[PDB]
Amino acid sequence: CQPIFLNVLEAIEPGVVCAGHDNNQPDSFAALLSSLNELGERQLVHVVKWAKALPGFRNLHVDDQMAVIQYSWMGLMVFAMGWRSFTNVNSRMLYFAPDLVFNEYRMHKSRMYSQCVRMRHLSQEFGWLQITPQEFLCMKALLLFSIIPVDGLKNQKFFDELRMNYIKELDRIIACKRKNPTSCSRRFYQLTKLLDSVQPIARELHQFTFDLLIKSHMVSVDFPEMMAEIISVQVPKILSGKVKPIYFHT
Ligand SMILES: O=c1cc(C(F)(F)F)c2cc(N(CC(F)(F)F)CC(F)(F)F)ccc2[nH]1
Position 104: which residue type? E
- With the most atoms of ligand 1 within 8 angstroms of its CB, the residue from 13, 34, 39 to mutate is 39
Give the side-chain half-sphere CA count within 13 A for 29: 14
Q: Whose CA is nearest to atom 18 of ligand 1?
A: 37
Q: How many C-beta atoms surround the C-beta of residue 91 within 10 A?
A: 23
**165 alpha carbon – ligand 1 mean position (Å):** 29
* 206 burial type by CB count under 10 A (0-12 exposed, 13-18 middle, 19+ buried): buried
Q: How far apart are CA 242 and CA 202, in angstroms?
A: 16
How many residues in total does the chain contain?
250
Query: Going by C-beta distance under 8 Å and a sequence separation of 6 or more, which residues neighbour residue 136?
Result: 83, 126
Q: Which domain holds residue 1?
A: 1-250
Cβ–Cβ < 8 Å for 167, 224: no
Could you tell me if 139 and 199 are in contact, meaning their C-beta atoms sit under 8 angstroms apart?
Answer: no
The alpha carbon of 208 is separated from its chain's Cα centroid by a whole number of angstroms, namely 16
Exp. method = X-ray
CATH number at residue 13: 1.10.565.10
Is the CB of 40 inside a 6 Å radius of any atom of ligand 1?
A: yes
Q: For ligand 1, what atom is nearest to the CA of residue 230?
A: 22
Number of domains the chain is built from: 1
Q: For ligand 1, what atom is nearest to the CA of residue 110?
A: 17
Contacts of 122 (CB under 8 A, 6+ apart): 78, 79, 82, 194, 197, 198, 201
Query: Amino acid letter at 72?
Result: S
Please give the DSSP secondary-structure letter assigned to residue 57. Answer: G
Distances (CA, A) of 249 to 82, 100, 157, 191: 21, 34, 22, 11
Nearest-CA residue for ligand 1 atom 19 is: 37
Query: Which amino acid belongs to residue 126?
Result: F
Q: What separation, in Å, do the N-terminal and C-terminal C-alpha atoms of the chain show? A: 35
| Nearest atom, ligand 1, residue 213 CA | 20
- Atom 6 (ligand 1) nearest CA: 78
Residue 148 and residue 157: Cα distance in Å, rounded? 12
For residue 223, report the distance from its CA to the centre of ligand 1, in Å. 12
What letter represents residue 70's amino acid? Q
Question: What angle in degrees, to the nearest 10, is found between the helix axes of 181-219 and 29-52?
Answer: 130
Nearest CA to ligand 1 atom 23: 40
> Ramachandran region of residue 136, left (φ > 0), alpha (ψ -120 to 50) or beta?
alpha
111 is in an annotated binding site: no
Report d(CA 126, CA 132) in Å as an integer: 8
CA-based radius of gyration for the chain: 18
Q: What number does the ligand 1 atom closest to the CA of 41 have? A: 21
Give yes or no for residue 115 CB within 6 A of ligand 1: no
User: In this structure, is the dihedral angle defined by the CA atoms of residues 119, 171, 13 and 203, taken in order, positive or negative?
Assistant: negative
List helix spans (H) across 95-180. 104-109, 113-128, 133-144, 156-175
